[PDB]
């Protein structure tokens, strides 16, 4: 079965081996589907990222094709640029843009963002989601770990390994996918769902940005899911630490009934996002500057 899948991947990826033009691989990250290294382009001295995913180490091996469909069809300003894909031994390698500012996780766990900064992030993410949802693409793993930054504060969506497409022929998805603490209620309830689940997950990320952790983060994953499924929408630790504008925004995200939840398109017009600062406003939050 493994050799069968190797062959299948070979027919969709680029030919060759990026080790022929890259030097000095250094591991910088570990994700749900594999590791991420920086590498130096020999000819230019430029830095790229290389995501390496072991075919044998996947829960759902077929989801590896998501990397390919996204790379081919859904490139965008607030989405990480993907350059080439390769089959290297038993691994799928994706050579992509290096986002040197790192992931939003490092910021939310170590510093407190103000609302100019939170609004900047939300605006960037919602811009990406509005375009993706309009083409039927659902990300399904929105969380601070999936948001990457450039050195000058530009925000980009990454980690599309769990995404799916809906359409007239396939209006809803049914799969149990994502990261427990960020999963929408209807998804946990095993109801057919749509792009609305990304909006709930963004709400949880707003809580990350304000409080530093998602709700129920101290609980075990399976217990947290049960609590998300059963209880009223999760609450901020301290409501006084958010403006009424941000509270009103968050209230449109964390709605249990998917039909009543705001869409990305509608949220781009919300007053809270008027507070959004330029990318420069994010820069002082990064490790190399604080
Ligand atoms: O920052 S990453 O190293 C990362 C991922 C994908 C592309 C990247 C591009 N440049 C820097 C870091 C990147 N990352 C590890 C996996 C899951 N945890 C957080 C994300």
UniProtKB/Swiss-Prot annotation:
Per UniProt, subunit arrangement is: Interacts with FGFR2 and GRB2. Interacts tightly with GTP-bound but not GDP-bound CDC42/p21 and weakly with RAC1. Interacts with INKA1. Interacts with SH3RF2. Interacts with RHOU and PAXI; the PAK4-RHOU complex protects RHOU from ubiquitination and acts as a scaffold to suppport paxillin/PAXI phosphorylation.
Q: Which cysteines are joined by disulfide bonds?
A: none
PTM text: Autophosphorylated on serine residues when activated by CDC42/p21. Phosphorylated on tyrosine residues upon stimulation of FGFR2. Methylated by SETD6. Polyubiquitinated, leading to its proteasomal degradation.
Q: Which residues bind ATP?
A: 28-36, 51, 97-99, 159-161
The stretch of residues making up the signal peptide is: none
Name under which the protein is recorded: Serine/threonine-protein kinase PAK 4
Give all residue intervals belonging to the Protein kinase domain: 22-273
Localization terms from the record: Cytoplasm
What family is this protein classified in?
Answer: Belongs to the protein kinase superfamily. STE Ser/Thr protein kinase family. STE20 subfamily.
| Tissue specificity | Highest expression in prostate, testis and colon.
Instruction: Note down the stretches annotated as region GEF-interaction domain (GID).
Output: 1-24
Q: Please list the residues that make up the active site.
A: 141 (proton acceptor)
Q: Which residues carry this modification: Phosphoserine?
A: 175
Known function: Serine/threonine-protein kinase that plays a role in a variety of different signaling pathways including cytoskeleton regulation, cell adhesion turnover, cell migration, growth, proliferation or cell survival. Activation by various effectors including growth factor receptors or active CDC42 and RAC1 results in a conformational change and a subsequent autophosphorylation on several serine and/or threonine residues. Phosphorylates and inactivates the protein phosphatase SSH1, leading to increased inhibitory phosphorylation of the actin binding/depolymerizing factor cofilin.
């Amino acid at each position: 079965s493994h050799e069968q899948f190797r062959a299948a991947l070979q027919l969709v990826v680029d030919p060759g081996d990026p080790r022929s033009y890259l030097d000095n691989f250094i591991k910088i990250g570990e994700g749900s589907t594999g590791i991420v290294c920086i590498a130096t382009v020999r000819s230019s001295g430029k830095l790229v990222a290389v995501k390496k995913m072991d075919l044998r180490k996947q829960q759902r091996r077929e989801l590896l094709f998501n990397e390919v469909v996204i790379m081919r069809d859904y490139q965008h300003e607030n989405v990480v640029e993907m350059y080439n894909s390769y089959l290297v031994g038993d691994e799928l390698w994706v050579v992509m843009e290096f986002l040197e500012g790192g992931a939003l996780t490092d910021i939310v766990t170590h510093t407190r963002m103000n609302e100019e900064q939170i609004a900047a992030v939300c605006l960037a993410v919602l811009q990406a989601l509005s375009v993706l949802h309009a083409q039927g693409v659902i990300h399904r793993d929105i969380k601070s770990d999936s948001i990457l930054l450039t050195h000058d504060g530009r925000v980009k969506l990454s980690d599309f390994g769990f995404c799916a497409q809906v359409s007239k022929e396939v209006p809803r998805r049914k799969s149990l996918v994502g990261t427990p603490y960020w999963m929408a209620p209807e998804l946990i309830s095993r109801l057919p769902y749509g792009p609305e689940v990304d909006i709930w997950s963004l709400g949880i990320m707003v809580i990350e940005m304000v409080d530093g952790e998602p709700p129920y983060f101290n609980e075990p994953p399976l217990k947290a899911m049960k609590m998300i499924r059963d209880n009223l929408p999760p609450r901020l630790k301290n409501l006084h630490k958010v403006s009424p504008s941000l509270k009103g925004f968050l209230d449109r995200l964390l709605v249990r009934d998917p039909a009543q939840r705001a869409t990305a398109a509608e949220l781009l017009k919300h007053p809270f996002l008027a507070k959004a600062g330029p990318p420069a406003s994010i820069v002082p939050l990064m490790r190399q500057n604080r």
